[PDB]
Every structure is written in C-alpha cells, then in structure tokens.
C-alpha cells in the first residue's frame with residue numbers, strides 16, 4: 001500500500017554497512033551512493049559495487065546510476081549498466097568501469113556514483129504501417 005512518490009522515496013538498509021542516499025547540494029540532480037564494502041576496480045577492468053540498499057523508485061520514474069564527475073576526470077571511472085527499474089527490490093549495485101592504467105581502490109563509505117530519479121513514460125506499443133514524416137527524416141549518425 002505505502003508507495004514512493006516524486007516527493008518522498010522509500011529506502012531500506014539491507015545491512016549495517018549501508019549508507020542512506022543523500023543529495024550533496026540543494027538542487028543536486030542525484031543522490032550520492034556510497035560503497036558498503038572495500039573493492040579494487042582493476043585497471044582496464046570492472047567491478048560490481050554493492051550499496052546494501054534496496055530502493056523503491058516512484059512509479060513513472062526510474063533510477064539511473066550515473067558517474068561522479070571528479071572520479072571520471074581524475075581516475076577515468078565510468079558507470080556501466082545503470083538502469084534501476086521502479087519495481088526492483090534487490091540490492092542496488094553500481095557497476096564501475098576503470099578505463100585507466102592504474103587500479104582504483106574503494107573503501108567502505110566512499111561515494112562512488114550518484115543516483116538520478118529520471119522521469120519517464122511507459123507507453124503501450126502499437127505497430128503501425130507508417131509514421132508521420134519529419135524534417136529530420138531518416139537522417140542519423142552525424143547528418144547535421
């Protein structure tokens with residue numbers, strides 16, 4: 001019965017190591033996500049980081065795991081995967097890619113990504129015989 005809304009999102013800690021998501025500025029797009037454990041993201045490699053949080057993203061939205069800009073510029077860290085469905089009730093994981101040539105060390109509590117509650121539509125699909133014509137048309141992949 002009790003469901004998240006755009007104004008109030010429900011979060012459950014799955015262990016004593018989880019840190020609640022928190023926005024770092026007044027109008028920050030995302031909630032900072034902290035690692036629940038120590039990890040090493042190998043050079044040119046990847047690592048799935050557990051937050052030990054379960055989140056109920058409000059219906060009409062999804063949660064996008066997104067990169068922190070400092071770790072991207074300084075450490076060549078990117079976020080893979082990243083689509084968290086509003087019906088997902090498992091452990092929120094952050095998939096990190098390390099494109100650099102040095103390992104990237106993560107300690108428990110380090111903020112290693114952010115979580116953006118992005119508004120979406122979930123339309124029904126109708127197969128049609130023709131689509132409306134536009135100026136763009138089939139122009140894609142570097143037309144403009």
Ligand SMILES: O=c1ccn([C@H]2C[C@H](O)[C@@H](CO)O2)c(=O)[nH]1
Pocket residue numbers: 065080081082083084085086087088091092093094095
């Ligand atoms: O970065 C990601 C991508 C996916 N998932 C989970 C939630 C999502 O609903 C499910 C299937 O993509 O896996 C995560 O925890 N993190």
Ligand SMILES: [Mg+2]
Pocket residue numbers: 078079
């Ligand atoms: Mg990308």
Ligand SMILES: [Mg+2]
Pocket residue numbers: none
């Ligand atoms: Mg899927």
